[PDB]
Amino acid sequence: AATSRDALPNTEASGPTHSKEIPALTAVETGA
């Protein structure tokens, strides 16, 4: 149902972080 002329996603407000979640780290070897 996503039309070509639909608006792209909104930027959500984000605060400080001190976590075990690591989005910045990855492994491109996987192919992704």
Partner 1 sequence: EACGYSDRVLQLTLGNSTITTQEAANSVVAYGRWPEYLRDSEANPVDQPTEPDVAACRFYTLDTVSWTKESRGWWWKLPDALRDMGLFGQNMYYHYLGRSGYTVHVQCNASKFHQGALGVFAVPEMCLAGDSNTTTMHTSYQNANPGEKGGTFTGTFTPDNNQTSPARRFCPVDYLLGNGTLLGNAFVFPHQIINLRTNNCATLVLPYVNSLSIDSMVKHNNWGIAILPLAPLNFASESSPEIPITLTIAPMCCEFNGLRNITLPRLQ
Partner 2 sequence: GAQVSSQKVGAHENSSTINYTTINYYRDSASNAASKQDFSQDPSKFTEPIKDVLIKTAPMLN
Partner 3 sequence: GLPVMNTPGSNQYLTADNFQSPCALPEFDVTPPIDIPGEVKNMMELAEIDTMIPFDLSATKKNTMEMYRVRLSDKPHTDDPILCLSLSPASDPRLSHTMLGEILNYYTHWAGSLKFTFLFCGSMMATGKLLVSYAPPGADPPKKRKEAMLGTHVIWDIGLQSSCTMVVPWISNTTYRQTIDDSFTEGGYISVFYQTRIVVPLSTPREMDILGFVSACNDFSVRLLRDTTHIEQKA
Residues that bind partner 2 (CB under 8 A): 1-6, 18, 21-23, 25-27, 29-32
Using CB under 8 A as the binding rule, whether residue 3 contacts partner 3 is answered as: no
- Identify the residue whose tokens are 């996503």: 2
Instruction: Please give the angle made by the CA atoms of 19, 8 and 26, to the nearest 5 degrees.
Output: 35
Residue 9 binds which entry of partner 3, partner 2, partner 1, none, with Cβ cut-offs from 5 to 8 Å by kind? Answer: partner 3
Torsion of CA 25, 26, 27, 31, to 10 degrees: -150
Interaction partner, residue 16 (partner 3, partner 2, partner 1, none; CB < 5-8 Å by kind) = partner 1
